[PDB]
């Protein structure tokens, strides 16, 4: 952007097409589950027993909890 | 979900546009599906973006900066665009078939074209003179060196 | 708009002989050609013109709120710029408080 | 992933800063003709001069001769937007 290197295609306006590179960059990766399941025993964990045979919570829930919660969106 | 215009699908708005059966000038979030009309070129995404920028409606109010309207005819001039003349005179050079005709009055826009929108949706200037002057039949448009 | 010349008072345009009539309620007429051929005006894409930011992009140095970048300035030579990214094609304007902007702006 | 380090970081860059040229020179040109007027079926430079390199960018020598032979139009025309 600084460069002014950042062509937005036909149809959307610069900033439009700025916000939604940074909305793609900034989602985590299927990868972030690595280093939960490095720290988790998942016999022995109730968090991720929980999750993971559905009786409550997700997988966000656990990213949130222990990684990070990420980019707040709204709308 | 999304708030924006055009895309307004926040809330119950969808719903309430259903349900209400309200009109098509009163949708928020409208969409349409449109096939290719030929099965076997249907695989090619560099021709579904073709056709797809291709039916985007772009107006003349799209790509205009300002635009101001006189009381000159042609065949006297605002003083601030005196020096439209040159500009002028080129068009009437290299259009030898175009010159102006003789039912020409004093009512006349001038119109100046934003390039950045230009640019930006591929919009070049023969498109605009051939969509407004086989569009409009009382009217002579002149444009600039491109 | 054209202020008639006894009482100030704005004055009709009125269109008829093939030119301007300036008329007053006054009955004062003008005539008036050549400048006020123009009758309509319209900018487009106000909200995002030049004069829209300008005390803005030269206030915008001594603002202690706008974002500063490690960028040498090309005529006093200080480490640092404020940035400004104004307009929806978010054009980067980079300003110093000697003056100097970065070529648009 | 643990052997990323050992990458030279010049040699990523420069190539990285070639690629992203490529790139954003035919994401602009996808559709867009440098002619002008889209109609990028596979005539002019609205799309390319023959083969498939709307996208591709790893066969070399045909996405170059494209960039070199409209290199000043598009570095115009991003002038232009940028101000
Ligand atoms: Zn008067
Ligand atoms: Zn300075």
Same mark, same amino acid.
């Given at each position: 952007?600084?460069?002014?290197?950042?062509?937005?295609?036909?149809?959307?306006?610069?900033?439009?097409?700025?916000?939604?590179?940074?909305?793609?960059?900034?989602?985590?990766?299927?990868?972030?589950?690595?280093?939960?399941?490095?720290?988790?025993?998942?016999?022995?964990?109730?968090?991720?027993?929980?999750?993971?045979?559905?009786?409550?919570?997700?997988?966000?829930?656990?990213?949130?909890?222990?990684?990070?919660?990420?980019?707040?969106?709204?709308? | 979900?999304?708030?924006?215009?055009?895309?307004?699908?926040?809330?119950?708005?969808?719903?309430?546009?259903?349900?209400?059966?309200?009109?098509?000038?009163?949708?928020?979030?409208?969409?349409?599906?449109?096939?290719?009309?030929?099965?076997?070129?249907?695989?090619?995404?560099?021709?579904?973006?073709?056709?797809?920028?291709?039916?985007? /409606?772009?107006?003349?109010?799209?790509?205009?900066?300002?635009?101001?309207?006189?009381?000159?005819?042609?065949?006297?001039?605002?003083?601030?665009?005196?020096?439209?003349?040159?500009?002028?005179?080129?068009?009437?050079?290299?259009?030898?078939?175009?010159?102006?005709?003789?039912?020409?009055?004093?009512?006349?826009?001038?119109?100046?074209?934003?390039?950045?929108?230009?640019? /930006?949706?591929?919009?070049?200037?023969?498109?605009?003179?051939?969509? /407004?002057?086989?569009?409009?039949?009382?009217?002579?448009?002149?444009?600039?060196?491109? | 708009?054209?202020?008639?010349?006894?009482?100030?008072?704005?004055?009709?345009?009125?269109?008829?002989?093939?030119?301007?009539?300036?008329?007053?309620?006054?009955?004062?007429?003008?005539?008036?050609?050549?400048?006020?051929?123009?009758?309509?005006?319209?900018?487009?894409?106000?909200?995002?013109?030049?004069?829209?930011?300008?005390?803005?992009?030269?206030?915008?140095?001594?603002?202690?709120?706008?974002?500063?970048?490690?960028?040498?300035?090309?005529?006093?030579?200080?480490?640092?710029?404020?940035?400004?990214?104004?307009?929806?094609?978010?054009?980067?304007?980079?300003?110093?408080?000697?003056?100097?902007?970065?070529?648009?702006? | 992933?643990?052997?990323?380090?050992?990458?030279?970081?010049?040699?990523?860059?420069?190539?990285?800063?070639?690629?992203?040229?490529?790139?954003?020179?035919?994401?602009?040109?996808?559709?867009?003709?440098?002619?002008?007027?889209?109609? &990028?079926?596979?005539?002019?430079?609205?799309?390319?001069?023959?083969?498939?390199?709307?996208?591709?960018?790893?066969?070399?020598?045909?996405?170059?001769?494209?960039?070199?032979?409209?290199?000043?139009?598009?570095?115009?025309? &991003?002038?232009?937007?940028?101000?």
């Amino acid at each position: 952007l600084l460069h002014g290197d950042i062509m937005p295609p036909i149809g959307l306006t610069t900033h439009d097409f700025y916000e939604k590179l940074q909305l793609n960059a900034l989602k985590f990766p299927d990868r972030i589950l690595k280093p939960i399941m490095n720290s988790i025993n998942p016999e022995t964990n109730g968090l991720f027993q929980m999750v993971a045979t559905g009786a409550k919570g997700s997988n966000p829930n656990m990213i949130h909890i222990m990684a990070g919660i990420g980019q707040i969106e709204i709308n | 979900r999304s708030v924006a215009g055009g895309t307004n699908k926040s809330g119950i708005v969808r719903p309430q546009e259903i349900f209400s059966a309200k009109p098509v000038e009163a949708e928020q979030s409208s969409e349409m599906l449109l096939r290719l009309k030929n099965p076997e070129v249907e695989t090619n995404k560099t021709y579904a973006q073709e056709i797809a920028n291709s039916i985007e /409606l772009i107006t003349f109010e799209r790509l205009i900066l300002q635009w101001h309207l006189l009381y000159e005819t042609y065949s006297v001039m605002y003083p601030d665009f005196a020096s439209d003349v040159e500009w002028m005179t080129d068009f009437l050079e290299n259009h030898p078939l175009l010159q102006p005709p003789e039912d020409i009055a004093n009512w006349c826009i001038r119109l100046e074209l934003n390039k950045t929108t230009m640019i /930006l949706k591929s919009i070049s200037l023969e498109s605009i003179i051939n969509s /407004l002057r086989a569009k409009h039949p009382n009217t002579y448009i002149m444009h600039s060196v491109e | 708009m054209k202020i008639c010349k006894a009482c100030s008072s704005c004055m009709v345009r009125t269109y008829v002989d093939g030119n301007i009539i300036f008329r007053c309620s006054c009955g004062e007429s003008v005539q008036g050609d050549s400048q006020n051929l123009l009758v309509s005006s319209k900018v487009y894409h106000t909200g995002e013109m030049e004069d829209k930011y300008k005390i803005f992009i030269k206030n915008a140095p001594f603002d202690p709120t706008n974002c500063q970048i490690k960028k040498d300035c090309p005529n006093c030579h200080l480490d640092y710029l404020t940035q400004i990214c104004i307009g929806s094609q978010k054009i980067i304007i980079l300003v110093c408080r000697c003056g100097y902007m970065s070529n648009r702006g | 992933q643990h052997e990323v380090g050992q990458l030279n970081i010049k040699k990523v860059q420069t190539a990285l800063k070639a690629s992203l040229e490529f790139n954003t020179f035919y994401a602009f040109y996808e559709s867009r003709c440098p002619k002008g007027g889209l109609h &990028d079926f596979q005539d002019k430079k609205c799309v390319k001069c023959g083969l498939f390199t709307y996208i591709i960018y790893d066969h070399l020598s045909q996405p170059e001769l494209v960039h070199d032979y409209y290199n000043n139009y598009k570095d115009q025309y &991003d002038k232009e937007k940028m101000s």
